[PDB]
Amino acid sequence: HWGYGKHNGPEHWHKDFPIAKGERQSPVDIDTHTAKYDPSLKPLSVSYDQATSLRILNNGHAFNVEFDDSQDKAVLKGGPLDGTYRLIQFHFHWGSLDGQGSEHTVDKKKYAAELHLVHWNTKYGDFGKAVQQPDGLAVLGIFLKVGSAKPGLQKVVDVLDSIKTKGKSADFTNFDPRGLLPESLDYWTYPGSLTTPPLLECVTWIVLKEPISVSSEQVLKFRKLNFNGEGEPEELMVDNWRPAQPLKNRQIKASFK
């Protein structure tokens, strides 16, 4: 039932998923002046050299690039984290227009899109059990602005016409997610939630300070996807972002400045 329209969009989600009005929901606006520098935060460790992508999937909300997470091959650790989190999939949220699309905002600024690299804590053995735990996931969020193309994004963009509609998948091997990372790993971090139902409060968010730039041609090709299944009326997959939620009793920490 849930989605991103007038009738089933984010302001409706609480009726199926009451935790939507919970105490640690995401995304949030990152007010950069009030984020606390924490000199004891460590550098983020991104170890993606052995990443095994497998498939790319249009699940009707976004598209996910899935990885083999049955061994420690693409892991995130250090930063604010204890122990080791395995990359399971990434996806993006984007707008109908370049002026919107990101879920987190920075001093109320919206970016054209936001990439989420989703990782689960190995001490919980799999994704499904990790999401039930308050330290189960670590999501690395990277903003996209439109400008020069991101060469490392182009293989994703080029396969989109093969998974246009909900339920479609395609083989997607040998994709290297290092090609999507900006130069700096300076980050902000706070405890939050999944930004789509079930909205579970299991995520340590790590949002990079530096956006990557992608071309208008790349993000236009995101907007040609469809939220519908094949043979259903065309509904463009645009504006699949949840707006900022109340910070409540949380402090956003910065690894820098």
Ligand SMILES: Cc1cc(C)nc(Sc2c(F)c(F)c(S(N)(=O)=O)c(F)c2F)n1
């Ligand atoms: C209980 C359960 C089971 C399964 C298989 N997926 C999930 S989904 C999920 C989700 F709902 C999210 F919002 C996010 S996110 N956008 O990066 O915050 C996510 F990464 C996810 F992987 N939840």
Ligand SMILES: [Zn+2]
């Ligand atoms: Zn997401």
